[PDB]
Amino acid sequence: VPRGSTSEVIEDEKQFYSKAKTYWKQIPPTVDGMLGGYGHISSIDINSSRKFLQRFLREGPNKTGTSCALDCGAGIGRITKRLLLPLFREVDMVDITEDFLVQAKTYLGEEGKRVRNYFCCGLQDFTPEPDSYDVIWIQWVIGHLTDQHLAEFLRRCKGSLRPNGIIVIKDNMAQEGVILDDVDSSVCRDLDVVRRIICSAGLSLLAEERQENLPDEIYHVYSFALR
């Protein structure tokens, strides 16, 4: 029987969060650090994310705005730099690892002057301002929250969307069940589990896409656009 919830795999919630914090504190503040030794795939990832996002920026009744985005688990700002800053007047970043947000100021260069808030906080403790973001981008971090905290965070994100705003989740997906990585202190969930959590948060899918052109050996990666 596969596991369907983080409560089947997390022995101790406080340790699940504390171990993850310690893990990221000792990762280099680099693109390769952000991507776990896969820094080389960054351009494939960004190109796909851009195409995915552009579907929502077309003119019409439901056009997503371009005033402000929120990058969640932003790290040093890989996605902020190459995807979001070019498309959004301002960007806010949130990440648990202070050293990454310090590095971001260097990494982002002159364009980083348009990063407005650098929030150093776990997502589980973060309440984004109501009616503030056109796009909330959550990439390669949902596995660091419990199911309850992920559901709650998505509810809070829903409340922070501007009219026509969207949440995007892009992350590793398990073939089946909920799989603990006890080294980085994270889980990988199957598509059914993730969809269940999204539904629990009062959100709906606008689109879902598998990331192509990745190394064969890694977990599959999917993008979801939600409102």
Partner: peptide, 6 residues
């Protein structure tokens, strides 16, 4: 991060 299937 992206990572090897365990």
């Amino acid at each position: 991060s992206p990572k090897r299937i365990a």
